[PDB]
Every structure is written in structure tokens, then in C-alpha cells.
From a paper:
CTP synthase (CTPS) catalyzes the final, rate-limiting step of de novo CTP biosynthesis (Lieberman, 1956). Each CTPS monomer consists of a glutaminase domain and an amido-ligase domain connected by an alpha helical linker. Glutamine hydrolysis in the glutaminase domain produces ammonia which is transferred through a channel into the amido-ligase domain, where it is ligated to UTP to form CTP in an ATP-dependent process. Budding yeast have two CTPS isoforms, Ura7 and Ura8, which share 78 % identical residues.
We solved filament structures of both Ura7 and Ura8 in substrate- (ATP and UTP) and product- (CTP) bound states. Ura8 yielded the highest resolution structures, at 2.8 Å (substrates) and 3.8 Å (products). In the Ura8 structures, all ligands were clearly visible and bound as previously described for other CTPS homologs, including an imino-phosphate reaction intermediate recently observed in Drosophila CTPS, and the presence of two distinct CTP-binding sites per monomer recently reported in human and Drosophila CTPS. His360 interacts with D370 which would be stabilized by protonation of His360 at low pH, and likely explains the pH-sensitivity of the assembly interaction. We see density consistent with two rotamer positions of H360 that may reflect partial protonation of the sidechain at pH 6.5. This suggested to us that one function of yeast CTPS filaments is to constrain the enzyme in a low activity conformation.
Numbering used by the authors:
A (entry chain A), B (entry chain D), C (entry chain C): 1 to 443, 456 to 571
């Protein structure tokens, strides 16, 4: 096993997840199998309790693991599948040793943070980095560790001490450290003393970095590079200039231009890992596919506008996987994506009493949209706004996708406005009020990867067509409610066909409305299964419907 | 004596000299006598050997001290005069103890950095902070110490250790520390971990800050202030938000808006220093004069353009005192200054063979200029370009000031083009070549404050008029050459009158050319004597000549 | 050049000079030429101003360099001669860069502690480690650097930073670091946390140690060694157990038993330095001579007692070279030395009025003595006591040596008691009092190595015989006075022959008194020229006179 640790810096939120993902993608272009571990110094066992207002969206795994947003970045860049064990947290590792003590597995010794907890960390990283993450049952060749937080924080102290020991418990040339750092630019001068103080913290903590990755608002001056290469004991070829770029799909081709594969191949002896010529064709076949999609990103010009209708649309990280999944669809259509961020509460008429500026900008955006996404939000407070957005799309012929809550607000709209039961509602919003036309009912989270099976009278639908007309759809779930089965044949009598269901048939999972160009809803989250070179089919269908050429896309899918 | 230390930070060049000068100016608005000390952790005895390419211009004192650029900032903001002892350097203080050892004044003890060198530092700061710096023979009430470099550097280690001890060798409430710090803003988020790591270095080194001054590209968010006030054990009222502003004359009125006098008055018991009501009128009379010049900076609109003709005009700090002296003149004329920065070598015709873009932009600027300054540069390599700039101004009637080298290139121009000896030259450029018409000759630097006396037939001149027609001019010198006295009566026969001289008459120090609107030259540097509320008379005369209203200015000066 | 740095620790005065000297002596037993540098973080230019009450005796070099006591330890263990440049101090190196700045040799850059002062240190260590220190004009093969003070002190900061850089400016395998450390033993348990906190300071400062030398009141337990080898990343074979031993001549044979040559030979590639078989015989010929003198130290039993008569005899380090020179004489006679430490002031009768216990213990010791040394002290306050000790030895036939002041008090005794001028005196004690029989007169220190030449009528003397009857004696001087030449032929008429003089004959340097078994005085210090395997001839003559077998020693010297 080789290890690359991506670490620390002057600030949090600097770019370690981007460089970790680019490094893994780049190493994969030598044919190497790459895995990843996120370490988060936070104490939470997993992200499933904590709200999207900190660290962005909760990411959902095939396991049903509700995990760190960084694991989603590794899944999409590398083409890999991760377990809940691939996210280390302070909570998991302190919990592991405490549960092991009360059972007596330390045989009556005193259990100390060094060695015992720092040995639990190294036992975990070795257990987990050998887990299969590809379509093939090979153990990986490289693990990337993203060390969360900043080096020199109390919460990081056990993890840097475990990595200090891991650098020796595993051999040298099986371990490298990349340190990401900030170069401020002040009055036209690029300042080196923040990055120098960060190299002192690594030395203090007993680690040496093999690369410095410098994050800056400019290209680094070669005099600034020389200075960093004087204070840190590294050559000029070991400071990578990682400036601010408009697109993160370009960052792998920045580091390829900067010899970082060529360095790591000589620092980690990567040419001495056994690989076939088949593995070495697959590597450059991924590289040329990356150069293709990045060329097609730069010379594309024709725009498509998608309204994302939700709450808290100012924290754009609360929709990170949705956003990436709209981008992958856009890149496969070769049209420039603009997301129009629409707060659903501002669509409600009462906003015109509260602040007229917010009311009109929301409807200005929703009218401007070539397609609409209701993204699969959290907490029912915006539903009466999203019901307008679903009504607008159905009354007007505008392309629509409804994810999770986007099944539900669309079925609630269709019930109130096409069946004509005007109070019919989400039980999560009203519960004890006991209305008779319950659209949502509870059937205790239904979590992780499940099979969805198409109902037989459904090959007419665009959504079965986009999935290659394969009999089953396997996708990730994070829901507590269903559509009520008693209202299904009522809705189907009116053309709102539940095109796909759970194998038991009690649970409604995909619809398409008859006759509309594209009015699709999924109870799963199709975001989490999106890959950079293979967009998620419901999002590719929305961006194609919004662009025209939905038929030419369905034709290409059918080969 | 009270002490304010202004210190450290995440980066060098952060703003300590601006905040130190603003703090001293602000405290002076309570009637308090304020002094300053710069500590530079560099080893140089004084700046007189080191070139303007690092740390900007060398500043010249009345003593003839060639000192740090920061001492000039204190002189102009506070209205004070400083000795060469007011700049502490590592060289001076290590030299002081080494010279004292070889003489035996430690009486055969081992001389250690702690206590002995750190006691030399505290003996110096007490010796020097009692020196008179005003027009009155009172000892000061407050000393500002600017601690150069960054806290946590090896070169700073003896000075922070001396200040750690000085906080106790002098009482508490006679000492306060202001720490200047950087808040980066990255993806629209203001980052606190660089300022937290800087508070850990102060605690490690045994100092606590009383203010945090946060330097940022935005106003601080109140949540960012709350966070800094959680990690550092200080109230919200002790983080001052010192954002990037277009003008530094505004920075005192920022800190006045932020209660920093009101805090320091309760932290340093400044109301318990004895002062008269006369002292308390003088304080608010300076404050209202500052509010006047800053109001007159904001509502002024009509521009004046001055060409500054020199070398290395890309390092604008190489002309810092010249620049401030043009600004003070501009503020008293109530016209917005634009400095046009003109590289004199680019004015030479050979530049049109080398790069035509540089040739035309230089002459584009010099033609655009309402006035010209030849600023008093260093090293003769640009003189043939400045001779064109002096010719242009004389042939065309454009207002001119020549400082130091600007006497000399103008007299060299007047000799070559109006007397008609076409090879006549600066002996510093040609020496051993032994031409007969030597314009410069040597008469070993003539340094610091000297008297200049007006020749009798000179009250006609604008330059004697601008000086209030007072018989002597006292100004600062830093020159090795003179104009040749054998060429003086030749030049005076042609109207180039040497309006002022040294008391011996051998040495030529001020000219005015007959008939031209303003063609003045000084061998002294009038920059170093410029004050924010009283501009240097030769620069006020140039900016007035460039604006028109030179007569209305001379009238106001004559009262 | 190879470098070994001996460094730091938990406490000052731990044993670095003993381990540095043992390492150099041991490496010399491979035939390698070894040199040494002491770094002292004190500010003094040289030891010649500072009194023996701190850091022990001032050591005198052939240059006339008054230097650190540690340079004497290297001279005697290694068989080498050192210049005043071999002692680096903070004063010398800050003085060097400050003198170089005022002359302009930094060409107008800003001179910073890093790089410029830390480059002066590395330029010095390379300049000086190539200096010839043997009897042959070869440049050395190895330099030992003793880094004075403790690592993590402010005064050490520039020297550890220079050594951090020197580890890379010179290659790896040309540099090794030995760290000396304390293991306390508390309630029968050997404590490792002080040595762990010292390895953290080295990592913080960017150095890794190749050996840990652990100083302890016991042999280290192998569990304690294992623990130190867990926390520091080093094998068990790299912790050397350097326990408290009664004799320092044993410490080389401790480290030879502990494979420290065998480690350093593989860590520094010492087998790849070119050497002849002649060099490899000389190495083991020194080793077997060390095993001989250490065997002859352990199986010797018969005692000899020497009174050392001086001031401040409680600070035994104030006589370190005298003490070692009595030991080398004792080891060559094969008799166990006891120094009886006699305070000369306590010999004065007035002490019997002040404290009778001190009076009788002094005369109890002086009566017990088989020989007497007056050691060459400092400051005249004890002379009237030493005059009794010189009288006692002359009246009683007890063997005597008088060094520096020990010429002078003996001649003052002989004048007062055998010529019979009872007030005759040391001019340094009385000056302005102007007595006529001045024994001392001034002839401005007479410093360093000088030639002394024997007067012709002197081959009868034991002191000319002990020197091999060679015509000149070359020895080190540190005196300001002489014996008066006007009193010489008076003294010689009475049998007190001045057996040796300066080449000019004005200056009296060696005596022997006729008829007494051994009553010798030298104005030079014979201590500084003493070697472990070749004792200084005047001290070997005293210990032989005290033991009997002075004749058998003179016979062995005469071959
Ligand atoms: N080279 C880059 N150029 C521009 N933006 C970048 C670059 N690298 C990262 N970013 C952006 O910075 C933001 C945060 O980066 P990232 O998520 O990698 O942070 P982090 O330091 O790993 O920690 P956190 O998980 O707390 O955000 C994201 O919006 C990301 O797109
Ligand atoms: N509040 C501020 N807003 C905008 N510019 C500022 C502010 N404070 C300082 N500056 C500018 O920052 C630059 C450097 O500031 P300053 O000279 O005070 O730096 P310093 O940290 O004291 O050290 P140095 O002497 O090395 O420059 C100057 O151009 C100054 O005008
Ligand atoms: N292994 C040892 N066993 C016993 N005594 C020792 C040992 N090593 C050193 N010593 C004694 O310790 C004392 C101080 O040791 P040394 O002179 O080497 O100290 P240091 O740490 O180099 O610093 P300093 O020059 O300030 O004394 C001396 O008396 C010396 O003989
Ligand atoms: O105000 C100042 C700034 C600097 N200095 C002295 O000059 C040196 C200049 O160093 P700075 O700290 O100004 O910069 P740097 O070379 O470390 O690199 P950047 O932060 O710009 O990337 C400092 O280390 C200090 O010795 C002062 O004496 N005063
Ligand atoms: O990538 C990350 C970032 C952060 N964290 C965890 O969340 C915390 C968030 O802290 P950050 O370090 O992200 O910010 P902060 O609150 O210290 O303040 P600013 O720098 O933004 O001013 C960190 O201290 C760490 O515990 C991670 O686990 N991973
Ligand atoms: O009073 C105590 C002592 C120790 N301990 C806990 O037990 C551990 C025992 O560690 P100690 O600090 O007692 O010893 P050590 O193993 O570091 O080595 P020596 O200093 O003896 O050479 C400590 O690190 C701490 O975790 C306590 O909880 N309380
Ligand atoms: Mg935060
Ligand atoms: Mg991340
Ligand atoms: Mg710099
Ligand atoms: Mg400054
Ligand atoms: Mg020593
Ligand atoms: Mg223990």
C-alpha cells in the first residue's frame, strides 16, 4: 500500500479535498487502483444528525452511511464506492477504544492516547485501505488520506501523532505528505511568512512535507517559489502553484503541467507496483477522457438555465452533489450551465407583503428557467412555495425533475390541482391535524442503496428510456415517508403513472406524467450516483429536456 | 511614561507603522506629548549603506542620522523631531553590549542575552523615551514602540523577551500591546485561524495583547469579531476592524469611530497624567484640523498632475517622503494629486530603438504634466534622461522643482543649452575623464540639518517669497558634490541666479531662473521637513505653480 | 570534513565536554586527525576579562588567547593545539558581521540573522575546521563541535539554526548529532519524560539526534533504554548509557564497550576516509596506551598527598588544569593522588582569632602534605598566607612547586627570611607605598607561548634535568610583573639561582634553590602544556619528589 496524506495549512477550507481528489484522479492515469480515507477531527459519529448549515450536505453511501461531504468528492472523481468505515472521526476512534476497554481487550493495562489510541488509528487505516472500492475484487495500490481541520489544533493532535508513527510503522517510499498552504497577496506583494509558520508546526509535530501546494490569488512569482524552497528543505520542483481557477475540472491538468505525477512516481517508487499493459491503457484512456471533457468545457458557448428551487440557496454547499450532477449533465450536453438559485418561500405571495424585491427576483428567475429542479431538501417549511413551482412547470410545459421531497410536492400539487382535493398534504407538516386526503404517509429511515423495479406499462416513459430500459434501477435512499397507495390508482386514472416501485409494490419511487415533455420524479437521490464522465440519468434527462436534443440523447443511450 | 507596543502579525508589511502613527496622532488629541521608537530586528547599524531597493527610501534626520523609513512616518504624523537613538536595531544593541564588555563594565561576570542584552534594551527604551521631541523642553507622556518584523522570528526573540520583562520592570497600566493581524477572505468567508495561531505565539512568548487590530479586505462581520473575542480573552470592544481604505489620512478617524482612545484612556489611566486646559484645547485643535484636511480630501474634485522623473519608479516606496510631500501640498491647494511616475531613462531616444511602448508612454506622461519634479535620486545612470526633462520644462514654461540631483541636472542642462558648453557634466558620472567645464565638483557627506542663507539680490524670487522672506532657511542635507563656484557668475550673467548659499558662500544651495513662472532647485531635501498640516514650501510652490493660484498662496504665506 | 555536534540536554553542566573529548579520543584510535570547536552562547569576546568564579579557570593558548575552559579539555585528550578562532562566541560572531556591515561588504542589502549571521557561523566553522592542529601540516578529518548551553534557550537560537542549515549545506554522512540528556531516578524508578521533552525541542528546532547519551545515577535498565528508543526514532544500539563514574579517564572505555565507534563508522562512512597502515598503527597504539594508564589507575594503591595552596579552593574548577596536571604526574608515578585543598588566608594567624576550626584544618593539611603547590592564582589578597606555606617548605625540606605568583611569593619569602629585608614585597599589593626592596616590578600582559632559555651554570638543577637538559623551554605566559633584576645577584649570592630567563636576560622565569630536595618556581603556567600520556615536567618533578623516586624518574627522562 502507498499512502499520500493531504494536510493542514494556514486556514480551513483551503482546497485539500480538491487536491486530494485531483491527486487520486491523476495517479489513476498510471493504471493504479486508488482509495481514499477522510479524517475529520470532529466528534460526531456520522453526519446524519447534523444539519446542512455546517459542512454542507450530508452525503449518503450504499451502506446507508450518512457521511462527510468530502467522501462524495472522492466517489465522483475516482469512480469508487466507499463504506462508512472510510470516514474516520474522533468519535468513531475514541468510541472504538472505549468499547474495547469495557470488554477487557487491553488485558488490564492502562490505555493511553499514545500508544493505544494512536495504534487504533494505524490499525484502522491499514484495515480500511485494503477494502475493495472498484468494480473488481483487487485490494487498492494507493490510499489518499485527507487530514481535516488544520495542523496544530488540539483536535488534530492524536491524528498527526498517529501519522508521525505511521510514516515509520509503514516504510518510507510507501508514505508521502502534501501540505496545502496560503500565500496572501497584499499591496501587490506575495507574502511567505504564513507558509513558513505552517512548516514550523509540521516540524514541531515531527512531520516533513514532500510537496508544498501553495494556494494564491495569482500565479506564484518564481522569486516566491525560490523563497519557499529556501525555508522549507525542498527543491523548486516540489512547490506546486495552485492558484484560484474558475473550474475545478482544470485542477488535475494544472498539477499534470507541474510534474506532480513525475515527482510522486520517483518519491513513492510507483513504477515498481506490478501493473499490466491493460492497466496502462485504462490510465491514459481516463486521461484523454478528462482532456476531452475539459476542452468541451472551454469551447462550449450555448447556455442552459436550470432553476434549483429550495431553501437556504445562499449556502451553495448545501446542494453540492445536486450542483455537480447538473454540471455533469451540462458537460455531456456540451452547453454552459447556469444554476438559477430560487428560494421557494420567496415564490409565495405573502413575500410580496414582506419584501417585493425578493418576490419578483424569485419569479423573474423561475420564468427565465429552461428547466426546473426541486432538489430533495430537508424540513417542510418551504413546501407551499415549491407547490407553485411544480404547478408552474405542469401548467406551462417546462422540463421538471423532482427528487425525494420533489416526488412529494409534485404529487401534492397534482392532487390539489388535477384530481381536485384542494387541502391534500404532507403528513410531516401537519401530522395530528388528521385531514382525510393524506398524500404522504409513513411506511426507521429507508436508507442506502435499494432496488427499484419498473411497473410493466412504462416503456412509453422518458424516465424508463433514460435508464436504458433495464428492468431494475439501483439507487440510494434517505426518506421516511411514501406516497399513499390508496391515492395511486386515483392518480393513475388521471395520467400520473407511478412508473417504478419497490419489489413489494407498497412503495412508490418513480413517476412520469403522461403527455408533458419531461415531468419526472424520483424518491431516491440520483445525485449520489453521478460520475464526472457518466452523469446521473434523471439529471441528464432534465438538462437534455431543457436544451432540446432529449431525443438525440435517448438515441445515444439506447446503443 | 506610558508605553504602547505595536507588534507582529501573520505577515510583514501589514500596517503597524500606519496604526502606530494613527495611535500617536489620536493620543495627541488629548493634549498628551507623544514620542516613538522603531525597533528593527535587522542587523544594520543604520540605513545609510543600504540601497532603496529594500525597505524603501533612507530617511535623513537633523542629526545627520540615515535611518528607517518608519521614523519619517512618526515625524510627519506627530509633529516631532527624532535622533538616531530613536531607531533601535539588532546591530546597535549587540554593538552597545560588546563595546561595554571589552571595556570591562560587566566587572568580570559572564554576559548573557538574558538578562544583560535584554536589560540593555530596557535601559535604552527608558533613556530614549525621556528625550525631548517637541518645540518645548518637556519629557514625553507616551512612547509608541513599533516592533518590526513578525513575532516568533529568531531575530525578534531578544526584543519580545525584553518587552515581556519591560511589562513588569515598568508597572501594568504604564504598558499596553496592540497586535496587528490578518483576516483572509476566501470564497466569501472571513477566516480566523491565522489570527488564532498568532495569539498562540504571543502566549508562548509570554505577552497578552490589549487590542487586536484586524486587517482585512472587507469590514469584519460581527460574527468574526465575536469569534476572535472568544479565542483571545478580550471583549468585542477590543477587536478593531482596520479594513483596506484608499487613503491613510482616514485611518485615525476609523479608530476614533471604534472607541480606541476611549479604551486606551481606561487601560492606561491617561486621565491621571497632569495636563492644563491649554493642553486640552491644543488636542482638539489638532483633531478639528485633521477632520478639516480629511473633509477637504473627500469633497475636492479638480485634479493636478505632477511628473516625478526618476529611476525605479515601480518601487513607489523609494520616494515615500517625496510622495507624502506632494500630497501635503495638494491637500493645502485643495486639488486631487495624480503623480505621473516617469522613468528618466525611458525619456532617452535610444529607448525608441529598445522598446517603443516605453519611449512613448514616458513622453505621453511628461507632456501631460501640469508640473515636474526631479526628486533627488541616487546613482548617476539616469541623468541624460533627466536633462531632457529639465530642458523640456525650461523651453516650455512648465513648473519645475529640482531636489539635490535636481539642482545638478538643471545646472548641467542650463550650461549645455543656455551658456552653450555642450559636454559640461556631473563629475560623479565621468571623474577620471577630466573635461574642463565641470558643473559638479566635490567640496565626507554633507549631512543633516544645516543653515542656508539667501544671497542679497533675491527677494524677487518665488522661492525666497515662499519661505516667508525669512533671512535663513534651515533644511536637511545628504550630498557630496556642489555646483562649481567658477561657473556661478557665468550662470548668473545669463539669469540663473543662485538665490541661496552656505554661510561661507563657497556652496550653492537654492536657485531660481529669472522670468520662468517657477523653475526652482534646492540642494537639500525639502521632503524630510514636510508635515501633514504644514507642507514643505518648495513642494507647495510647485503644486501651486501647476494649479495656478501661486499668487494667492504667496499672499496667504505673507500674512 | 566530518562533523560531530555534541549538544544540549535537560540541564547545563551535564557532561558534553567529557563526551566530546572521549568521542574525539576514540575516533583518533582509528588513525583519524580530529579537531574541535567550542561554541559558547555567551556574549564575551574571550574569557580574559571574566573572573574564575564563573565557568572555572581561564585557559591560555599559544596565541595568547584567554579562552574557554572546554578548549583545555580538547587539547589534553586529543594531543592538539588550538587558536583563539576555535572558540566561537555570540560576541565574536555578532562582532564579525557588524564590522563587515560598517565596511559595506553586504553591498547595501539588509543584513538579517537568517541568512547572514547563520551564514557567518557556517563560513567560520568551515574556515576553522580546516586549520592544522597536529604536529603535521595535514587538514583534519573530523571536527567535534560542542554546542554550549541548552537547546531551546534564546542565546542558542542562531547556533541551532546555523547547525540545522549546516546539516544540508554539508552533506548527510558528513554530519552527526549526539544529544546528552538526564534520566532522573526517583523512588527507585528511572524517569524518561525529561529526555522526551528534550527530543521535542530538537524536532521543533529542526534537528534529529543520531545518538542519545543518557546521564544517570545508575546503569540504565534495558526497559528504560527500550522506552527512549520508542519515543525517539532510533534503535536500542543508539542510546548510550553514560552513568556517573568516579574517574573520567574511564569514559572512553565505556563508550568503546557500547559500540559508539562502530555506530559512527557506519553513520559517518569513516572507513571511506583515506588512511595508511601507519595511521592505523598509531590509532591502536594510542588505544593501548589509554588501556595501560586506566589499568594503572585501578590497580595502583600507594597514596601521595599534595597541598594546593590558594584562594577559593571550594570552587575546584578554578584550578581545573592544575588538577589535571597533578593527576597526569600521579598516573606516570603510579601513585594515587590526594589533593589537599588549602585556603592560604586560613594559614594566617589572625584566622585563629576569627575561627579556630579553619586555622587548624589548614595547618593540619599543610603538615600532612608530601608536596606543596602554589598554583598561580589571581588577586594579591592571600599572599601573606602563601609566604608561610613557602617558608614552611624551605625550613622543612618538603617538595615545592611555585607557578606564576608561586615564583613571586617564594622570592618574597626568601628576601624577607634568608636575605633579611623583612618588609620586601609584591608591588601589585602596595604600589603607591614606595618601599625600597621591591621584589616584584612591572616590565601589557606578557601572554601566550614564549621561549625561556637556561642560564649557563644550571645543569646541576633538578628543573633543567626534568626538561631533558634541552637548551630552551617553550611554555605559556599570563603575567604582568617580573622579579626585580637588581635583587637577582643578591639572591644568587645566597643560593637562590635564577636557572632560566627570557632571551634578553631582563626577565626571570625559572629558579631552583641550592641544596633543597625540590624547591622550584616557574613564572609560566606549566599546566596548559600537560597531556594525559605526557605530564608537564615541573608537576611530574613535584609528584616524584613527594613520592621519592625523583632519581629513577630523572633517569627515565634522560634516555
Ligand atoms: N484551486 C482552487 N481554485 C479555486 N477554488 C478552489 C480551489 N481548491 C479548492 N477550491 C474551492 O475551495 C472551497 C473549499 O475547498 P475544499 O472543500 O477542498 O476545502 P478543505 O480545506 O478541504 O475543507 P472543508 O471541507 O472544510 O471545505 C470549495 O468551494 C472549492 O471548490
Ligand atoms: N489600513 C490600511 N489600509 C490600506 N493600506 C494600508 C493600511 N495600513 C497600512 N497600509 C499600507 O500597507 C503598506 C505597508 O504598511 P506599513 O508600512 O505600515 O507596514 P509594516 O507592517 O509596518 O512593515 P514595513 O515597514 O516592512 O512595511 C503601506 O503601503 C501602507 O500604506
Ligand atoms: N560521565 C560522567 N560521570 C561523572 N562525572 C561526569 C561525567 N561527565 C561529566 N562529568 C562531570 O560533570 C561536570 C561538568 O561536566 P562538563 O564540564 O562536561 O559540562 P557541560 O555540560 O559541558 O558544561 P559546562 O562547561 O557548563 O560545565 C564535571 O565535573 C565533569 O567531570
Ligand atoms: O517592518 C519591518 C519589516 C521587516 N523587517 C526586517 O526585514 C525582514 C523582512 O522580512 P518580512 O518579514 O518583511 O518578509 P520575508 O522575507 O520574511 O517574506 P514575506 O513575508 O514577504 O513573504 C524581517 O524578517 C525583519 O528582519 C523590519 O525590521 N521591519
Ligand atoms: O475540512 C475540514 C474542516 C474543518 N473540520 C472541523 O471543523 C472545524 C471547523 O473549523 P475551521 O478550522 O473550518 O474554522 P474555524 O471555526 O477555526 O474558523 P475560521 O478558520 O473559519 O475563521 C475544525 O476545527 C475541525 O474540527 C473538519 O473536520 N474538516
Ligand atoms: O498521576 C498520574 C501519572 C500518570 N498518569 C497517566 O499514566 C501515564 C504514565 O506515564 P508517566 O508520565 O507516569 O510516565 P511515562 O511512561 O511517560 O515515563 P517516565 O516519566 O516514568 O519515564 C501518563 O502519561 C498518564 O497518561 C495519570 O493519569 N496520573
Ligand atoms: Mg469555521
Ligand atoms: Mg475536505
Ligand atoms: Mg520580504
Ligand atoms: Mg513599519
Ligand atoms: Mg563544556
Ligand atoms: Mg511510567
Amino acid at each position: 500500500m502507498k499512502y499520500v496524506v493531504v494536510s493542514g495549512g494556514v486556514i480551513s477550507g483551503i482546497g485539500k479535498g480538491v487536491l486530494a481528489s485531483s491527486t487520486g484522479m491523476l495517479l489513476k492515469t498510471l493504471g493504479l487502483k486508488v482509495t481514499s480515507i477522510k479524517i475529520d477531527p470532529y466528534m460526531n459519529i456520522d453526519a446524519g444528525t447534523m444539519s446542512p448549515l455546517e459542512h454542507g450536505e450530508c452525503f449518503v453511501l450504499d451502506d446507508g452511511g450518512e457521511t462527510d461531504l468530502d467522501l462524495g468528492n472522492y466517489e465522483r472523481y475516482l469512480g469508487i464506492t466507499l463504506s462508512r468505515d472510510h470516514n474516520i472521526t474522533t468519535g468513531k476512534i475514541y468510541s472504538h477504544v472505549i468499547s474495547r476497554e469495557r470488554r477487557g481487550d487491553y488485558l488490564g493495562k492502562t490505555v493511553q492516547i499514545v500508544p493505544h489510541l494512536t495504534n487504533a488509528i494505524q490499525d484502522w487505516i491499514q484495515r480500511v485501505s485494503k477494502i475493495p472500492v472498484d468494480d473488481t475484487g483487487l485490494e487498492p495500490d494507493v490510499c489518499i488520506i485527507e487530514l481535516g481541520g488544520t495542523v496544530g489544533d488540539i483536535e488534530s493532535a492524536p491524528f498527526v501523532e498517529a501519522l508521525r508513527q505511521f510514516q515509520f510503522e509503514v516504510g518510507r517510499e510507501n508514505f508521502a505528505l502534501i501540505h496545502v498552504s496560503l500565500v496572501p497577496v497584499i499591496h501587490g506583494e506575495q507574502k511567505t511568512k504564513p507558509t513558513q509558520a505552517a512548516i514550523k508546526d509540521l516540524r514541531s509535530l515531527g512531520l516533513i512535507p514532500d510537496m508544498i501546494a501553495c494556494r494564491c490569488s495569482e500565479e506564484l512569482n518564481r522569486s516566491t517559489i525560490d523563497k519557499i524552497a529556501m525555508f522549507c528543505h525542498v527543491g523548486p520542483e516540489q512547490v506546486v502553484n495552485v492558484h484560484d481557477v474558475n473550474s475545478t475540472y482544470h485542477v488535475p491538468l494544472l498539477l499534470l503541467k507541474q510534474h506532480m505525477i513525475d515527482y510522486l512516481h520517483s518519491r513513492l517508487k510507483l513504477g515498481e507496483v506490478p501493473l499490466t499493459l491493460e492497466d496502462k491503457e485504462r490510465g491514459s484512456q481516463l486521461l484523454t477522457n478528462w482532456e476531452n471533457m475539459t476542452k468541451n468545457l472551454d469551447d462550449s458557448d450555448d447556455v442552459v438555465k436550470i432553476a434549483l428551487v429550495g431553501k437556504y440557496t445562499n449556502l451553495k454547499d448545501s446542494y453540492l452533489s445536486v450542483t455537480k450532477s447538473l454540471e455533469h449533465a451540462s458537460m455531456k450536453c456540451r452547453r454552459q450551465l447556469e444554476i438559477l438559485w430560487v428560494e421557494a418561500s420567496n415564490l409565495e405571495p405573502e413575500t410580496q407583503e414582506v419584501d417585493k424585491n425578493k418576490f419578483h427576483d424569485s419569479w423573474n428567475k423561475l420564468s427565465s428557467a429552461d428547466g426546473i429542479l426541486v432538489p430533495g431538501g430537508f424540513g417542510t417549511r418551504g413546501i407551499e412555495g415549491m407547490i407553485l413551482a411544480a404547478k408552474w412547470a405542469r401548467e406551462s410545459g417546462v422540463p421538471f425533475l423532482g427528487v425525494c421531497l420533489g416526488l412529494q410536492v409534485a404529487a401534492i400539487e397534482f392532487a390539489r390541482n388535477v384530481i381536485g382535493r384542494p387541502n391534500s398534504s404532507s403528513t410531516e407538516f401537519l401530522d395530528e391535524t388528521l385531514l382525510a386526503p393524506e398524500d404522504q404517509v409513513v411506511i426507521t429511515m429507508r436508507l442506502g442503496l435499494r432496488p427499484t423495479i419498473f411497473q410493466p406499462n412504462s416503456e412509453w416513459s422518458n424516465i424508463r428510456k433514460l435508464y436504458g430500459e433495464v428492468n431494475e434501477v439501483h439507487e440510494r435512499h434517505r426518506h421516511r415517508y411514501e406516497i399513499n397507495p390508496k391515492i395511486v390508482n386515483d392518480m393513475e386514472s388521471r395520467g400520473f403513472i407511478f412508473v417504478g416501485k419497490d419489489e413489494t409494490g407498497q412503495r412508490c419511487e418513480i413517476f412520469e406524467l403522461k403527455g408533458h415533455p419531461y415531468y419526472v420524479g424520483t424518491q431516491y437521490h440520483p445525485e449520489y450516483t453521478s460520475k464526472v464522465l457518466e452523469p446521473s440519468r434523471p439529471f441528464w434527462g432534465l438538462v437534455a429536456a431543457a436544451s432540446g436534443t432529449l431525443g438525440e440523447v435517448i438515441k445515444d443511450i439506447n446503443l
